[PDB]
Amino acid sequence: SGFRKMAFPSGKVEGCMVQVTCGTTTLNGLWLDDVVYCPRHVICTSEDMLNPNYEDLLIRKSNHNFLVQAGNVQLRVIGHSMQNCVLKLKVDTANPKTPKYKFVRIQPGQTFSVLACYNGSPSGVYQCAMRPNFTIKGSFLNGSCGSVGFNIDYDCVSFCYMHHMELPTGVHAGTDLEGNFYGPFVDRQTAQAAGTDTTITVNVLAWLYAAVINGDRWFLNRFTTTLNDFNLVAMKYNYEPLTQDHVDILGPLSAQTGIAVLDMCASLKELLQNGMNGRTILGSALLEDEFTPFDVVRQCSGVT
Amino acid sequence: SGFRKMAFPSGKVEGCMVQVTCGTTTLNGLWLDDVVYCPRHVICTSEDMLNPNYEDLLIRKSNHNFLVQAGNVQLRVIGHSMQNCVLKLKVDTANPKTPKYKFVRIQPGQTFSVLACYNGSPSGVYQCAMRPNFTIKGSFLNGSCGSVGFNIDYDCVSFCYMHHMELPTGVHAGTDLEGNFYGPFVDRQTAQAAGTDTTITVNVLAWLYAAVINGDRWFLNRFTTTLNDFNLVAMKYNYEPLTQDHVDILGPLSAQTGIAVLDMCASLKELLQNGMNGRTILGSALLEDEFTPFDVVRQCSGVT
Ligand SMILES: *CC(=O)N1CCN(S(=O)(=O)c2ccccc2F)CC1
Ligand SMILES: *CC(=O)N1CCN(S(=O)(=O)c2ccccc2F)CC1
């Protein structure tokens, strides 16, 4: 029993983190096989960051200008290319600790673990979600760029995020490992405002299921609703619309608890309309939306 | 910027987790050097757990009855002893992945990372605190016993917790790595009620400092207070008394923000008396008490 905001074990990713230096800029790189992936803004002077022309800036860079250090050992860079907003640095040594891995581009509402690093060294691990506005709410200081987000399926690490920048509002933007930003963001020090940070409804419902499973049941009511009725209330409260696809995904939690998805919707409707009245659910005073239905099943069943 | 509930990178501890089986009971063990540490209740039938006499139960156990598996390789047990509520299984092979380590007994209010494991395999990592009632609020299913809590100082893992049991109220009790329970708890399936779970005041104040550092400042007020006045309010709200030792510990956060500790106390006093009024601090609707002042400094400064 008990339900915690839980990250994947980070060891498989720790073994992949390196330091990348170009000129006076140091940030983190991901070493998989004989390639080191890092944010392309490693080539910029903070002056360059105002309006950088990356292709033009890159012309002035040779293999030997990219200093890649794995622990206290230097890797030999034998090639470099830009793919979207990442650099791929080819090194002469395959990372001996390369896990089984995939690059995935996640959807908004999907959760992942971040291994926050500075100078290629791990400082911490925490759980995030891709927000519906394609930001993440992370913990990233100068030097953390190139830190990665991931999921693990048993022995296979799916890398989904690389950290690139902080918006003026202190929320975070980054890329998949093909260098494509989540959302409309660009690696430039310019006016970039996030859109509405809506609540991930399907994740809230998953977490309400988790609460019931773990004995927190006070919010279960006598009501049901319909997707359309629920969705009118969702809209009003800046919650994402609930689809039949979301209902289908919640089916196993429905099955386990015997609470129909639409009944749990009606409970969530009353919590939105009535608030918590000073009560808590799984030690939270607000409705948590950074657990997926898969997260709840995984944690509640003990998958390794 | 941004402030997250952050665990230590888990890799150094992942390399230490093994499976221990005695009869039909499987749980986790910690392999450091040529010793495997696990809960002594591994020797019990769930029948035994009602009123176990561990010394008597242990007489019936030989080295060869303790099945220790590290990945898919069996370790040879050449000795076993009971120390308090843990077994030490001597194996013929030093764990080649043994990190630098210490065993520490932490105080209430101190935070640590848990690597939740099943069958010696890591499932997740999350941040806990030793509650003032010597429970922890974890996430532990059957099979998770022998999972450990730890802190890392650069390269040295301080092990502070081993998971042993769930109270009827779904909170958790365990031992240090010398097998001594935190609090009054015993490894027996009996009536064990937790005392008052008080709020860790010094940690709340640390987290209020973290909020200011990260731009969440709405709760800063025009008031100050004294330790004695604050403490009258703390008592009323089931907050731990604040000592000058706590004020001293918060000094660096005071220095960095320019907010005197007693001023921040007066802010916390008004939040206790007035509530949050539907507002949030660092994305929380309640006052978070599972960050230590050291945690806030570490995360805000980017220690690896
Ligand atoms: C994103 C990231 O982690 N980095 C880019 C900025 N650099 S830096 O130019 O060295 C720097 C250092 C300190 C303050 C601002 C700043 F831009 C660090 C790596
Ligand atoms: C604490 C812990 O993780 N364990 C002790 C209980 N055993 S068990 O006896 O195998 C068991 C299994 C399933 C349900 C209850 C139960 F006690 C597992 C390890």
Coordinates of all heavy atoms in Angstrom, one line a residue, chain A residues 162-228:
Chain A
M162 N 15.0 15.6 -24.2 CA 16.3 16.2 -23.9 C 16.1 17.7 -23.5 O 15.3 18.4 -24.2 CB 17.3 16.1 -25.1 CG 18.7 16.7 -24.7 SD 19.9 16.4 -25.9 CE 20.6 14.8 -25.2
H163 N 16.6 18.1 -22.4 CA 16.4 19.5 -21.9 C 17.1 20.5 -22.7 O 18.4 20.3 -22.8 CB 16.7 19.6 -20.4 CG 16.3 20.9 -19.9 ND1 15.0 21.4 -20.2 CD2 16.9 21.9 -19.3 CE1 14.9 22.6 -19.7 NE2 16.0 22.9 -19.2
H164 N 16.5 21.5 -23.1 CA 17.1 22.7 -23.9 C 16.9 24.1 -23.3 O 17.9 24.8 -23.4 CB 16.6 22.8 -25.3 CG 17.1 21.7 -26.2 ND1 17.9 21.9 -27.3 CD2 16.9 20.4 -26.2 CE1 18.1 20.8 -28.0 NE2 17.5 19.8 -27.3
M165 N 15.8 24.4 -22.7 CA 15.6 25.8 -22.3 C 14.5 26.0 -21.2 O 13.6 25.1 -21.1 CB 15.3 26.7 -23.5 CG 14.1 26.3 -24.2 SD 14.0 27.2 -25.7 CE 12.2 27.6 -25.7
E166 N 14.6 27.1 -20.6 CA 13.7 27.6 -19.6 C 13.0 28.8 -20.2 O 13.7 29.7 -20.7 CB 14.4 28.0 -18.3 CG 13.5 28.3 -17.1 CD 14.3 28.3 -15.8 OE1 15.1 29.3 -15.6 OE2 14.1 27.3 -15.1
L167 N 11.6 28.8 -20.2 CA 10.9 30.0 -20.7 C 11.0 31.1 -19.5 O 11.2 30.7 -18.4 CB 9.4 29.6 -20.9 CG 9.2 28.5 -22.0 CD1 7.8 28.3 -22.2 CD2 10.0 28.9 -23.2
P168 N 10.8 32.4 -19.9 CA 10.7 33.4 -18.9 C 9.8 33.1 -17.7 O 10.1 33.7 -16.6 CB 10.2 34.6 -19.7 CG 10.8 34.4 -21.1 CD 10.7 32.9 -21.2
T169 N 8.8 32.3 -17.8 CA 7.8 31.9 -16.7 C 8.4 30.7 -15.9 O 7.5 30.1 -15.1 CB 6.5 31.5 -17.3 OG1 6.7 30.5 -18.3 CG2 5.8 32.7 -18.0
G170 N 9.6 30.2 -16.1 CA 10.3 29.2 -15.3 C 9.8 27.8 -15.5 O 10.0 26.9 -14.7
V171 N 9.1 27.6 -16.7 CA 8.7 26.2 -17.2 C 9.7 25.9 -18.3 O 10.5 26.7 -18.7 CB 7.2 26.2 -17.7 CG1 6.2 26.6 -16.6 CG2 7.0 27.0 -19.0
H172 N 9.7 24.6 -18.7 CA 10.8 24.0 -19.4 C 10.3 23.5 -20.8 O 9.2 23.1 -21.0 CB 11.4 22.9 -18.6 CG 12.0 23.5 -17.4 ND1 11.5 23.2 -16.1 CD2 12.9 24.4 -17.2 CE1 12.1 23.9 -15.2 NE2 13.1 24.7 -15.8
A173 N 11.3 23.6 -21.8 CA 11.0 23.2 -23.1 C 12.3 22.4 -23.6 O 13.4 22.7 -23.2 CB 10.7 24.4 -24.0
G174 N 12.0 21.4 -24.4 CA 13.1 20.5 -24.9 C 12.6 19.7 -26.1 O 11.5 20.0 -26.6
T175 N 13.4 18.8 -26.5 CA 13.2 18.0 -27.8 C 13.1 16.6 -27.5 O 13.4 16.1 -26.4 CB 14.4 18.2 -28.7 OG1 15.6 17.7 -28.1 CG2 14.7 19.7 -29.0
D176 N 12.6 15.8 -28.5 CA 12.9 14.4 -28.5 C 14.3 14.1 -28.9 O 15.1 15.1 -29.1 CB 11.9 13.7 -29.4 CG 11.9 14.2 -30.9 OD1 13.0 14.6 -31.3 OD2 10.9 14.1 -31.5
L177 N 14.8 12.9 -29.0 CA 16.2 12.6 -29.3 C 16.5 12.6 -30.8 O 17.6 12.5 -31.1 CB 16.6 11.2 -28.6 CG 17.1 11.3 -27.2 CD1 18.5 12.0 -27.2 CD2 16.2 12.0 -26.3
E178 N 15.5 13.0 -31.6 CA 15.7 13.4 -33.0 C 15.9 14.9 -33.1 O 16.0 15.4 -34.2 CB 14.6 12.9 -33.9 CG 14.5 11.4 -33.9 CD 13.3 10.7 -34.6 OE1 12.5 11.5 -35.1 OE2 13.3 9.5 -34.7
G179 N 15.8 15.6 -32.0 CA 16.1 17.1 -31.9 C 14.9 18.0 -32.3 O 15.1 19.2 -32.3
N180 N 13.7 17.4 -32.4 CA 12.4 18.1 -32.6 C 11.8 18.6 -31.3 O 11.5 17.7 -30.5 CB 11.4 17.3 -33.4 CG 11.9 17.1 -34.9 OD1 12.0 16.0 -35.3 ND2 12.2 18.2 -35.5
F181 N 11.7 19.9 -31.2 CA 11.0 20.5 -30.0 C 9.7 19.9 -29.8 O 9.0 19.6 -30.8 CB 11.0 22.0 -30.0 CG 12.2 22.7 -29.3 CD1 13.3 23.0 -30.0 CD2 12.1 22.9 -27.9 CE1 14.4 23.6 -29.3 CE2 13.2 23.4 -27.2 CZ 14.3 23.8 -27.9
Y182 N 9.3 19.6 -28.6 CA 7.9 19.5 -28.1 C 7.3 20.9 -28.2 O 7.8 21.9 -27.7 CB 7.8 18.9 -26.8 CG 8.1 17.4 -26.8 CD1 9.4 17.0 -26.4 CD2 7.2 16.4 -27.3 CE1 9.7 15.6 -26.4 CE2 7.6 15.1 -27.3 CZ 8.8 14.7 -26.8 OH 9.2 13.4 -26.8
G183 N 6.1 21.0 -28.9 CA 5.4 22.2 -29.0 C 6.1 23.2 -30.0 O 6.9 22.8 -30.8
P184 N 5.8 24.5 -29.9 CA 6.2 25.5 -30.9 C 7.5 26.2 -30.5 O 8.0 27.2 -31.2 CB 5.0 26.4 -30.8 CG 4.8 26.5 -29.3 CD 5.0 25.1 -28.8
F185 N 8.2 25.7 -29.5 CA 9.4 26.4 -28.9 C 10.6 26.2 -29.9 O 10.7 25.3 -30.7 CB 9.6 25.8 -27.5 CG 8.3 26.0 -26.7 CD1 7.6 25.0 -26.2 CD2 7.9 27.3 -26.5 CE1 6.5 25.2 -25.4 CE2 6.7 27.5 -25.7 CZ 6.1 26.5 -25.2
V186 N 11.5 27.2 -29.7 CA 12.8 27.3 -30.5 C 13.9 27.5 -29.6 O 13.7 28.2 -28.5 CB 12.6 28.4 -31.6 CG1 11.6 28.0 -32.6 CG2 12.3 29.7 -31.0
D187 N 15.1 27.0 -29.9 CA 16.3 27.3 -29.1 C 16.9 28.6 -29.4 O 18.0 28.7 -30.0 CB 17.4 26.2 -29.3 CG 17.6 25.7 -30.7 OD1 17.0 26.2 -31.7 OD2 18.4 24.8 -30.9
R188 N 16.2 29.7 -29.0 CA 16.6 31.1 -29.2 C 16.1 31.8 -27.9 O 15.0 31.5 -27.4 CB 15.9 31.6 -30.5 CG 16.4 33.0 -30.8 CD 15.7 33.6 -32.0 NE 15.9 35.0 -32.1 CZ 15.1 35.9 -32.7 NH1 14.0 35.5 -33.3 NH2 15.4 37.2 -32.6
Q189 N 16.9 32.8 -27.4 CA 16.5 33.6 -26.3 C 15.6 34.7 -26.8 O 16.1 35.9 -27.0 CB 17.8 34.2 -25.6 CG 17.5 34.8 -24.2 CD 18.8 35.3 -23.6 OE1 19.8 34.6 -23.6 NE2 18.8 36.5 -23.0
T190 N 14.3 34.4 -26.9 CA 13.3 35.3 -27.5 C 12.0 35.2 -26.7 O 12.0 34.5 -25.7 CB 13.1 35.0 -29.0 OG1 12.1 35.9 -29.5 CG2 12.6 33.6 -29.2
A191 N 10.9 35.9 -27.1 CA 9.6 35.9 -26.5 C 8.9 34.6 -26.8 O 8.5 34.4 -27.9 CB 8.8 37.1 -27.0
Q192 N 8.9 33.7 -25.8 CA 8.2 32.4 -26.0 C 7.2 32.3 -24.8 O 7.7 32.0 -23.7 CB 9.1 31.3 -26.2 CG 10.1 31.6 -27.4 CD 10.8 30.3 -27.7 OE1 10.3 29.4 -28.2 NE2 12.1 30.3 -27.3
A193 N 5.9 32.4 -25.1 CA 4.9 32.2 -24.0 C 4.3 30.9 -24.2 O 4.0 30.5 -25.3 CB 3.9 33.4 -24.0
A194 N 4.1 30.1 -23.1 CA 3.3 28.9 -23.1 C 1.8 29.2 -23.2 O 1.4 30.2 -22.8 CB 3.6 28.1 -21.8
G195 N 1.1 28.2 -23.8 CA -0.4 28.3 -23.8 C -0.9 27.8 -22.5 O -0.2 27.6 -21.6
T196 N -2.2 27.5 -22.5 CA -3.0 27.1 -21.3 C -2.4 25.8 -20.8 O -2.3 24.8 -21.6 CB -4.5 27.0 -21.6 OG1 -4.9 28.2 -22.2 CG2 -5.3 26.8 -20.3
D197 N -1.9 25.8 -19.6 CA -1.6 24.5 -18.9 C -2.9 23.8 -18.4 O -3.2 24.1 -17.3 CB -0.5 24.7 -17.9 CG 0.2 23.4 -17.5 OD1 -0.2 22.3 -18.1 OD2 1.2 23.5 -16.8
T198 N -3.5 23.0 -19.2 CA -4.8 22.3 -18.8 C -4.4 21.1 -18.0 O -3.2 20.6 -18.1 CB -5.6 22.0 -20.1 OG1 -4.8 21.2 -21.0 CG2 -6.0 23.3 -20.8
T199 N -5.3 20.7 -17.2 CA -5.2 19.4 -16.3 C -5.4 18.2 -17.2 O -6.4 18.2 -18.0 CB -6.1 19.5 -15.1 OG1 -5.7 20.7 -14.4 CG2 -5.9 18.3 -14.2
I200 N -4.6 17.2 -17.0 CA -4.6 15.9 -17.8 C -5.7 15.0 -17.2 O -5.4 14.2 -16.2 CB -3.3 15.2 -17.9 CG1 -2.1 16.2 -18.3 CG2 -3.3 14.0 -18.8 CD1 -0.8 15.8 -17.9
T201 N -6.9 15.1 -17.6 CA -8.1 14.5 -17.0 C -7.9 13.0 -16.8 O -8.2 12.5 -15.7 CB -9.4 14.8 -17.8 OG1 -9.3 16.2 -18.1 CG2 -10.6 14.4 -17.1
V202 N -7.5 12.3 -17.8 CA -7.4 10.8 -17.8 C -6.4 10.5 -16.6 O -6.6 9.5 -15.9 CB -6.9 10.2 -19.1 CG1 -5.5 10.7 -19.5 CG2 -7.0 8.7 -19.1
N203 N -5.4 11.3 -16.4 CA -4.3 11.0 -15.4 C -4.9 11.3 -14.0 O -4.7 10.5 -13.1 CB -3.1 11.9 -15.6 CG -2.3 11.4 -16.8 OD1 -2.7 10.5 -17.5 ND2 -1.1 12.1 -17.0
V204 N -5.7 12.3 -13.8 CA -6.4 12.6 -12.6 C -7.3 11.4 -12.2 O -7.3 11.0 -11.0 CB -7.3 13.9 -12.6 CG1 -8.1 14.0 -11.3 CG2 -6.4 15.1 -12.9
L205 N -8.1 10.9 -13.2 CA -9.0 9.7 -12.9 C -8.2 8.5 -12.5 O -8.5 7.8 -11.6 CB -9.8 9.5 -14.2 CG -10.9 10.5 -14.5 CD1 -11.4 10.4 -15.9 CD2 -12.0 10.4 -13.4
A206 N -7.0 8.2 -13.2 CA -6.1 7.1 -12.9 C -5.7 7.3 -11.4 O -5.8 6.3 -10.6 CB -4.9 7.2 -13.8
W207 N -5.3 8.5 -11.0 CA -4.8 8.8 -9.7 C -6.0 8.6 -8.6 O -5.7 8.2 -7.5 CB -4.2 10.1 -9.7 CG -3.9 10.7 -8.3 CD1 -2.8 10.5 -7.5 CD2 -4.7 11.7 -7.6 NE1 -2.9 11.2 -6.4 CE2 -4.0 12.0 -6.5 CE3 -5.8 12.3 -7.9 CZ2 -4.5 12.9 -5.6 CZ3 -6.4 13.2 -7.1 CH2 -5.7 13.5 -5.9
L208 N -7.2 8.9 -9.1 CA -8.4 8.7 -8.2 C -8.6 7.2 -8.0 O -8.9 6.8 -6.8 CB -9.7 9.3 -8.8 CG -9.7 10.9 -8.7 CD1 -10.9 11.4 -9.4 CD2 -9.7 11.3 -7.2
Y209 N -8.4 6.4 -9.0 CA -8.5 5.0 -8.9 C -7.4 4.5 -7.9 O -7.7 3.7 -7.1 CB -8.3 4.3 -10.3 CG -9.6 4.3 -11.0 CD1 -9.9 5.0 -12.1 CD2 -10.6 3.4 -10.6 CE1 -11.1 5.0 -12.8 CE2 -11.8 3.3 -11.3 CZ -12.1 4.1 -12.4 OH -13.3 4.1 -13.1
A210 N -6.1 5.0 -8.1 CA -5.0 4.7 -7.2 C -5.4 4.9 -5.7 O -5.0 4.1 -4.9 CB -3.8 5.4 -7.6
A211 N -6.0 6.1 -5.5 CA -6.5 6.5 -4.2 C -7.5 5.4 -3.6 O -7.2 4.9 -2.5 CB -7.1 7.9 -4.2
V212 N -8.5 5.1 -4.4 CA -9.4 4.0 -3.9 C -8.7 2.8 -3.6 O -8.9 2.3 -2.5 CB -10.5 3.8 -5.0 CG1 -11.4 2.6 -4.6 CG2 -11.4 5.0 -5.1
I213 N -7.8 2.3 -4.5 CA -7.0 1.0 -4.3 C -6.2 1.1 -3.0 O -6.2 0.0 -2.3 CB -6.1 0.8 -5.5 CG1 -6.9 0.5 -6.7 CG2 -5.1 -0.3 -5.2 CD1 -6.2 0.6 -8.0
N214 N -5.8 2.3 -2.6 CA -4.9 2.5 -1.4 C -5.8 3.1 -0.2 O -5.2 3.6 0.7 CB -3.8 3.4 -1.8 CG -2.8 2.7 -2.7 OD1 -2.0 1.9 -2.1 ND2 -2.9 2.8 -4.0
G215 N -7.1 2.9 -0.2 CA -8.0 3.2 1.0 C -8.5 4.6 1.1 O -9.3 4.8 2.0
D216 N -8.0 5.5 0.3 CA -8.6 6.9 0.3 C -9.8 6.9 -0.6 O -9.7 6.9 -1.8 CB -7.5 7.9 -0.2 CG -6.5 8.4 0.8 OD1 -6.7 8.0 2.0 OD2 -5.7 9.2 0.5
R217 N -11.0 6.9 0.1 CA -12.3 6.7 -0.6 C -13.3 7.8 -0.3 O -14.5 7.7 -0.8 CB -12.9 5.4 -0.2 CG -11.9 4.2 -0.1 CD -12.5 2.8 -0.2 NE -11.5 2.0 -0.9 CZ -10.8 0.9 -0.4 NH1 -11.1 0.5 0.8 NH2 -10.0 0.3 -1.2
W218 N -13.0 8.8 0.5 CA -14.0 9.8 1.0 C -14.8 10.5 -0.2 O -15.9 10.9 0.0 CB -13.4 10.8 2.0 CG -12.4 11.7 1.4 CD1 -11.1 11.5 1.4 CD2 -12.6 12.9 0.6 NE1 -10.4 12.5 0.8 CE2 -11.3 13.4 0.3 CE3 -13.7 13.6 0.2 CZ2 -11.2 14.5 -0.5 CZ3 -13.6 14.8 -0.5 CH2 -12.3 15.2 -0.9
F219 N -14.1 10.7 -1.3 CA -14.6 11.5 -2.4 C -15.5 10.7 -3.3 O -16.1 11.2 -4.3 CB -13.4 12.0 -3.2 CG -12.5 10.9 -3.7 CD1 -12.8 10.3 -4.9 CD2 -11.4 10.6 -3.0 CE1 -12.0 9.2 -5.3 CE2 -10.6 9.5 -3.5 CZ -10.9 8.8 -4.6
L220 N -15.6 9.4 -3.1 CA -16.6 8.5 -3.9 C -18.0 9.0 -3.6 O -18.3 9.0 -2.4 CB -16.4 7.0 -3.6 CG -15.0 6.4 -4.1 CD1 -15.1 4.9 -3.8 CD2 -14.8 6.7 -5.5
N221 N -18.8 9.3 -4.6 CA -20.2 9.8 -4.3 C -21.2 8.9 -4.9 O -20.8 7.8 -5.4 CB -20.3 11.2 -4.9 CG -20.1 11.3 -6.4 OD1 -20.3 10.3 -7.1 ND2 -19.7 12.5 -6.9
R222 N -22.5 9.3 -4.9 CA -23.6 8.4 -5.3 C -24.0 8.7 -6.8 O -25.0 8.2 -7.2 CB -24.8 8.7 -4.5 CG -24.6 8.6 -3.0 CD -25.8 9.0 -2.1 NE -25.7 8.3 -0.8 CZ -26.0 7.0 -0.6 NH1 -26.5 6.2 -1.5 NH2 -25.8 6.5 0.6
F223 N -23.2 9.5 -7.5 CA -23.6 10.0 -8.8 C -22.8 9.3 -10.0 O -21.8 8.6 -9.7 CB -23.3 11.5 -8.9 CG -23.8 12.3 -7.7 CD1 -23.0 13.4 -7.2 CD2 -24.9 11.9 -7.0 CE1 -23.4 14.0 -6.1 CE2 -25.3 12.6 -5.8 CZ -24.6 13.7 -5.4
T224 N -23.4 9.4 -11.2 CA -22.7 9.1 -12.4 C -22.9 10.3 -13.3 O -23.4 11.4 -12.9 CB -23.1 7.8 -13.0 OG1 -22.1 7.4 -13.9 CG2 -24.5 7.9 -13.7
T225 N -22.3 10.2 -14.5 CA -22.4 11.3 -15.5 C -22.2 10.6 -16.9 O -22.2 9.4 -17.0 CB -21.4 12.4 -15.3 OG1 -21.6 13.4 -16.3 CG2 -19.9 12.0 -15.3
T226 N -22.1 11.4 -17.9 CA -21.9 11.0 -19.3 C -20.6 11.7 -19.7 O -20.3 12.7 -19.1 CB -23.1 11.4 -20.2 OG1 -23.0 12.9 -20.2 CG2 -24.4 10.9 -19.8
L227 N -19.9 11.3 -20.8 CA -18.8 11.9 -21.3 C -19.1 13.4 -21.7 O -18.4 14.3 -21.3 CB -18.3 11.2 -22.6 CG -17.2 10.1 -22.3 CD1 -16.7 9.6 -23.6 CD2 -16.1 10.6 -21.4
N228 N -20.2 13.6 -22.3 CA -20.6 15.0 -22.8 C -20.9 15.9 -21.5 O -20.3 17.0 -21.5 CB -21.8 15.0 -23.8 CG -21.4 14.4 -25.1 OD1 -22.3 14.0 -25.9 ND2 -20.1 14.4 -25.5

